[model samples]
Target: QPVDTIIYQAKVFDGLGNAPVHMDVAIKGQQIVALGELSAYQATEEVNADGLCLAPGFIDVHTHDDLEVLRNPEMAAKISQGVTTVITGNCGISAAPAELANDAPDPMNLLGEKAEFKFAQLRDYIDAYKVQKANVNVAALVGHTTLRNNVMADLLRPATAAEITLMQQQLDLALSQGALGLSTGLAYKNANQAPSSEVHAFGEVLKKHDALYTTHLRTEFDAVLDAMDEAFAMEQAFDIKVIISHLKCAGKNNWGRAPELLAKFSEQGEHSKCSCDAYPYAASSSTLDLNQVTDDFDIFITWSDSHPEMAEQLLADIAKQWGISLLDAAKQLQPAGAVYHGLNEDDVKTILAFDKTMIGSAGLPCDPHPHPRLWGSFPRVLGHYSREQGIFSLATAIHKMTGLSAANYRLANRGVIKVGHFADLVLFDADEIIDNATFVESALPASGIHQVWTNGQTTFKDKRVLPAYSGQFLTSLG
Candidate 1:
C-alpha cells in the first residue's frame, strides 16, 4: 500500500535524549509506518528534508493555554514553532471542573475574564475541546484551585473535612473523565491555605487512578528548599509521581541556588518519582503582586484592571508616572499581570542542562504583554542554547521537549522516532531556527521552523500556519 506522506533525506532525532541518525520516514494515515530506507515507497506527497533535522513534535509541558487553545484554535504562537501538543492547567489554574462564584481571583484570571470559564466538569471542557478541535493536541491536569472553588464557599482557608470530601467527589468525576492528574498552585493565596494535609486528603484520587501530581511550589525563594520538602513529602504521602512546574530560584536573595535545590531534588527523586520543567528564559509571569513590587529587578506590567494604560510599562516607571511608591502603584493596578526578570541566567541554563529537565514554555496566552518564553522557548533552546552557545546538542534539546516530556507526562505512542508512533513531527533548520518574540513585540512567531505535522497532516509550513487543526484531547494512559 502507498503511504500518505514521505519525508526523505532527513536527520532524524528519535527523542531518546541522546542521539540521531540520517534516514527517510514514511507516514500512513496518522502513524509513522517506516523509519528508514523508504526510497522504494510511493506516496501521495513527498518532501525532501535535506539539511534539516526532523524530530517528534515539541510537547509544551507547562502552559496556561487552557482556554486559549479553544478561544483561538489556530495556536500560531505555539504550532508555528513546531509545538504539536500542549499540557494545560499548570500552576493550579484550569478552565474546567468549576464556574466562577464571582470574579476569578488572581491567577485563575490568568486563564481569562469571568465569562471565558464556564465548564463545570472536566467532561464539559473536553466536550468544548472536541467542538472547537484546536490546532495542537492538548492534555490537562485538574487544577486544585478549580476544585477548591467548586466545593468551598471561600478560598482564603483550608478545605474543611466536608469540603475535602466534596472536592474529592468532583476530582473523582474528572479523573473518570480522564484528567491527566491533579495540579496545585499552593503559592497563590487561593491555594496557600490548603495545608499539606488537605491536599493528601484528596490527592489519593490520583493514586487510585494511577495518575501523577504537578505543583507550582508553595514558595521558590530562600524557603524554596522547604517548599521542595513539601512536594517531596506529598510524593511519599500519596505514593505518586511529582512534577515541580517551572523550577527557578527567584528573588535577588536567591541566586545560584539551582545547584543546592537540584542536589536535594536528586536525592528526593532517587527514592520517589520527582522531576521538573522549566522555560529557557529567566523572567517569570503571573498576576501582578504587591509582594513583588521591588526595584531589585525589572518588573514589566502586562495588564491591569484599574490602569489599562500601563500595559508593557515598567512597574517602576508606572510608579513614577503615578507619583507614588511602587507598592502603592501596584495596589492601584489591583488584579493585574506582570513579568519579573528575577531568575539568574546561570541558574536558568544550569537547570536546563540537567539530565531529567524537560522544556515547558509556561506561556500565558491571555496576557497583552506576554513573556517571550511563549514564542521563543523551543527555538531559543535550539538556537541560543544549543546552536549559538552550544549548551547542549540539538538532539538533546529536542529530547527535552519531546521524549522526556512524553515519558514524564504519561503520553502514549508519541514523542519518539520509532515506527508506528503517531506522526507529530517538526522539521527545522538547526542553524537558523531562533525565537524573535520579546516583551515589547510579544506575538511574533519563531523562525526556521521549516514545517510541522500533526497526525501526518501539515499544520505549519514555511513559517505560515495552514489553518489545519489536527489536535486531539490527550489523557493519561494510566
Candidate 2:
C-alpha cells in the first residue's frame, strides 16, 4: 500500500527510553507503516524534516480538561505544546455520569458549570466526540468526587452504604464504557469527606477491571508522608497500580523532603507498580482555599466570582488594599482559583527527575489566568530542563512526557513512534524549543514545536493549528 504521508530526513526518537537517530518514516491511513528508506513510496502529503528532532507527541498524563475538551475541542493550551493525547478527569472532578441540578460544587466547578456537565453517562460523553472534537485525543479517569456527587445527597460526609453501592454501579458502568481508571482529588473538600475506606471501596472495582487508581492525595503538606502510605495501602488491598498525582512537598516548611518522600516511593515502587506525575513549575494551581492562605508564599488569585478584578493580584495585596485580613479577603473572594508559589526549586527538580515520575501539565483550562504550565510544560522541559540546563538529555525529557506516561496510564498504540504505532508525532527545533507563555501571558503558543501530527494527519504546524482535527476518543487498553 502507498503511504499517506512521508516525513523525510528526520531524527526519530522511538520512545522506548532511548536516543534518537536519523531516519525516514512513512505513514499509511492512521498508522506508521514503515521506517528507514521509503523513497519508492508515494504519499498524499510529504513533509521534509530538515534535520529537526522527531519524537512521539507529548501525552499529558494529568489534566482537568474533562469538560474543556468538550467545550473547546481545539485544546489550544494542550495541542499548542505538541500534546496529542490528554488523560483527563485528574484530581477527582470529571464532568460525565453526573448532572448537577444545583450549582456545581468547588472543584467540580473547576470542570464547568451545572449546564456543562450534562453527560449522564461515560458513553454519552464518548459519543460527543466528532470531527469538531478537540485536535488532541482524550482518555479519561472518572473522578471519585464526581461519582460521589452523583450518588450522595451531601458532599460533606462519607458516602453511606447505599451511596457506595450506587457509586460503584456508576464506576462499573464507566469502566465498561472505557474509562481509563479512577482518580481521587481527595485533597479537595468534595472528596475529602470520603475516608480511606471510601477510596479503597472504589479501588475494589479496579481489581476486576484492567484499571488503576490515582489520587491527588488527601494532603501534600506536612502530613504528605501519611498520605503516601495511604496510596501504597491501596495496592496492598487491591493488588493494583497506583499513581500519586502531582507529587510535591508543598510548603516553605516542607522543602528538602523530596528525598525522604522518593525514598519511600522507591520502596513502594520496588514492591508494586507505583509512580507519580508532576508539572515542571514550582507553583501549583487549583480552587482557592483559605487553608492555604499564609505568609509563607504569594497566593496569586487566578479567578474570583465576586471580585473578578482580583485575578492576578496577590491575596496579601488585596487584603492590604481592603483593610482586611488575608483569610477574610480569601473568604470574600469565595469560589475562586489561585496559583500558590509553594514548592522549592530544589524540590521541583528532585520530584521531576525521579525515575518513576511522569510529567503532567494539569492546567485548568477554565480559569482566565491559568497556570503557565498549561502552555509551557512540555517546551520548558525540552528547552530549560534538557537543552539549556542539561538536567537530562532531550530524549530522556521526551520520554518523561511520552513513553513513561503512556506506560503509567496504559494508553495503547500511542505515545511511541514506531512501525504499526499510531502516528502521533512531533517535530521540533531542539535548541530553539522553549515555553514563552508566562504569568503575564498564559495563552501564547509555544515556540519551536514545528509540526504535530495525530494519527496520519497534520494538526499543528509552525505555531498554528491546521483545519484538520484528527484526534479521536481513546479508550483504555487495560
Candidate 3:
C-alpha cells in the first residue's frame, strides 16, 4: 500500500544517542509506518533528503511561551528552528487556572498582560489550544505560583491551612483535567515566601495523581545545593520526580560550581528521581528583580514598563546616564524584563555536556528584545556546541533535545523516530544548522533547517512557517 509520504535516504538520528543511520522513512497519516529502504512504496509526497540529517523534531522542555503560542499561533521563533513541541507553563507561571485582579506579578507577566490572561481552568487553556492550534504541540504544567495567585490573598507569606486546601482543590481539579504536573518558580519573589511545608502540601495531591514536579529552585546561587536538597525532599516525601528548571549557577560569586551542583543528583543514588534542564547560553533572562541587580555582570534591559526607552540598553549604562546605583536604576525600571550575562561560560558548557542534562530554551517569547535562545537554542547545541565546540557528539546533543526531554517529561512516542512513533521530524543540513540569532539581533531564524513536520504535516519550510498547524494539546499519561 502507498504511504502518504516517504522521506528518501537521509542520515537519521533516532534520538537515542546513537550516531545517524542512513535510512528511508515512510509516513502514513501522523505516524511513521516504516524505515530503511522503501523504493517499492509509492507515496503522495517524496522528499529527497540525500544530503540532510533527519532527527525527531526538537522538544523545547522549558519555555514561557504560554500566551505567545495562543496570541501568535504562527510560533515562528520555535517552529522555524525545527522545534515541534514546547512544554509550557514553566517557571511557576501558566496562562490557565489563573485569575488576576490587578497586573500580573513579576515573572507571571512574562506570559502576558493581565488582560491577556483568560483561561480560568486547565481545560480552558486546553480547549483554547484546540480551537487555535499553533505549529508546535503543547504539554503543560500547572504553575504552583499560579496556584498561589489563584487562592492566596497575600503572596508574601506562607499559605494558611485553609488556603492550602483551596489551592490543593484547584491543583487536583487541574490534574484531573490533564495538567502534566506542577511547576514552582520558588526563586521568584512571588513564590519565595511559600515555605517548604506549604509546597509540600501539594505533594499529597501530586502523589495521589502520579504527577511530577518541576521547580525553578528557591535559589540558583551559593545556596543552590540547599535548593536542590529542597527539590529532592519532594521526591522522598512523595516518590514524585522533580525536574530542576534551567539549572544554573548565577552571579559571579557563584561561577565555577556546575560540577558541585550536578554531583548532588548522583550522590543521592543512581535511581534518584531528580533531573534538570539547562539552556545553551551562559546568560539568563527574566523579570528585572532588584535582588538580582549588580555590577558583577552586564545586565541588559529587554523591556521596562516604567522606562520603555531603556529597553535595549545595559543596566550599567542606564545607571550611569541616570547617575543612580544599579539597584536604584533597576528599581526605577520596575515591572520590566532583563537578560543577565552572569553564568560562567565554562559552567554552561559543563552543564550542557552532562549526560543527564536535558536541553530547554527557557526563552521569554513576550520580551520585545527576547534572548537569542528564543530562536537559537536547539541549533546552537547541534551546531556550535556539538559540531563546532566538540562539547559532545551530534547524536548525544539530539538525544538531549529530543528523546531525553520526552523521557523526562513522560511524553510518549513522539520524541524518537521509530516505526510506530508520531512523525514529528526535522530535516536539516547538519553542517550548516547553526543558530544565527545573537544577543544584538535576537529573533532571526536559524539557517539550515530544510523542513519540519509536526504529526506528519509540514509546518515549516524554507525558513518560514506554513499554515499547517498540526499541534495537539498533550495530556499527562501518568
Candidate 4:
C-alpha cells in the first residue's frame, strides 16, 4: 500500500505572498503533491490542523550549530521551534573540505569545548555529517575569516596576490562541492586583516558563481553606518548580492540608530540589491571575548559563563567588585564574559517591519545560559512582531524567515510551499504561539508549534522534537 500524508483544515500561508486560505496539503515521498480542499484526495494518514496557520518550515540564515548538531544530532532546540533548515558557518566559522593540520588554532570557546570538532577542510565536516546522520537540513558558507586564520596565521596585513589566488581556489572548490556562499566576520581581526581589495577579490569569485556574500560588518556598535556602507561598496565593487548578518545596534548609546541605518540602506537596497537579517530579541549574545563596557552598566545584562552568583550582575556590579569604573571592568572582562546590551525595542520593531530585512538568529549553541533567540527566534517573531505588536503582518514575517532567505542564498525547492519543493513545513496556532525562554531561564522551547516536518518526515510534534536523524547536508549548487 502506498503511504500518503495529509495536513487538513489549515489556514495556509504557503510562504508565498498569497493571502491565507483554508486548504489541505498532501505529501508523498518528500514532495507536496496536492494542496486544496481535503475532499479532493484520499490519504493513509491525516493530521487535523484545526485551522491553524501552516507555512514552510523556518530557515535560520545564521547559526553556530556546527558542533551542537554533531554532539546531540537530534537538534531539539531548533526543531521544536519549527526550524527545518539552518545556515551554519556564520561569523567566520565552519567545518569543511580539507585535512586538519596540527597547527590549527584552538577552536574558539564561544560555543564550548565540547562543541569543537576537527576536520581537514569545510568539505570534511559536511562528509562527517553524512556519516553521523544529522537531524535537520544544513547549508553551509565557507568562512572567509577561518580561511584567513588557517592559511595566514597572525599576519594582519593584506593577502598577497598569490594568497588571494589561493583563497579564490579554495572558495571555488568549496562552492563547487556545495557550499552555499561565503561568510565573513569583517568586524573580527582575521578577516579585517585582509584589505578591501583582498575582500573584493574573494567577492568576485562568489559573483562569478552567483553566490551570496554575507558579512558581520566591521562595526556594529558605533560604526554601523560605515559598516552598511561597506556592504554597499562591496556590492558595487563585486557586482554580487550582499547580506548584512544579524543587523543590530550593539551598545547602549547606539540603540536608536537602527532606523537611520535601515532607511539609508533600504533606499540603497532598492537600487543596488542589498538586504539584512535580524533576530527577534532586543538583546544579543556573543562571546565575552570583545566587549568593553562603560558607565551604562544598568543597560548591560550579563547572562552566561560568569559565576552563577554573579550571573545577574550589571557592568556596575562587576565594576564594584573590581573597585574600578564600569569601563575598566569591561576591559578586564574582555574575551570571557557575555553581556546583553539593551537595544531600543522600537529599533527592533522598525528593522523587523522593513521589507528587505529577513530574520536570522545569530544563535550560538554553546552558552551555559544563552539568549532565548537560539530556541525561540522564529516563534518569537510570530508571537511578538506579527501577532501581539503588529510590527509586521504574518505573511510578511513568514516571508522574511523563509522565502526571502531562500532567494538570498539562491536555494531552490525550499522556503516555499509548492509541488516540487521539499516537504519542509510548520504548523502552529498563530494566536497561541509565544517564546517561553527569557534571559533568566534560557533553555525553554517556544509555545504553539504543534508539528514540524523536514523532508516529508516529522521531526517535531506536540511541543517536543521527535527522536530521529532525518536532516540532509545542503550545499550551494544542490
Clashing residue pairs in candidate 2 (N, C-alpha, C atoms within 3 angstroms): 73-134
What stretches of model 4 exceed 4 Å from their correct place? 1-3, 97-107, 111-115, 266-271, 289-291, 297-312, 331-334
**What ranges in model 2 sit over 4 Å off?**
267-270
lDDT of 1 by residue, 1-478 (tens): 8999999998899999767788999999889999789889989999899999999999999989999998988899899888999999888889988778788866787788889887998998999999968789999998999889878777899889998998888888888897898899989988999998887876678888888789999998779888888888878777788899999899999988889878877556436578899999989998898887789999999989898998879999999999999999999997788999998999999999987789999988888778989888999999999999888999899999999999899888888878999999999988899999987897788888999998788899986888678889997666
Pairs with backbone N, CA or C atoms under 3 Å apart (clashes), candidate 3: none
**TM-score of each candidate structure, all chains considered together:** 0.98, 0.97, 0.98, 0.92
Ranking by TM-score: 3, 1, 2, 4
User: Model 4: per-residue lDDT, tens digit, 1-478?
Assistant: 2437899898888786567888888888787888787665778889999759899989898887866777777788888888888888777666653333334332344433622546556667787778766667888887776666556656577778887788788888888778887877777655666666777888778877788788888878787887778778778777777888888887777878877877767545444688888898777676543344455534344443334455556767777887987666666655344646557788888787877788887777876667778888888999988999888788888988888878777777988988778888999999998888877677788999999888888888886678567778887763
Local accuracy by lDDT, each model: 0.88, 0.86, 0.90, 0.76
Model with the higher lDDT, candidate 2 or 4: 2
Q: Encode model 2's per-residue lDDT on 154-234: one tens digit a residue.
A: 899999988998898898889889898899988887788799998888776887886978899999999999889989988
The TM-score measured for candidate 3 stands at 0.98
Model 4 misses residue 60 by how many Å? 0.3
Per-residue alpha-carbon lDDT of candidate 3 for residues 40-81, written as tens digits (9 for 90 to 100): 999999999999999999999999888998998889999988
Q: Provide C-alpha RMSD values for all models, in order.
A: 1.3, 1.4, 1.2, 2.6
Q: What range of 10 consecutive residues in model 4 has the weakest lDDT sum?
A: 98-107
**Which order, best to worst by lDDT?**
3, 1, 2, 4
lDDT for predicted candidate 2 compared with the true structure: 0.86
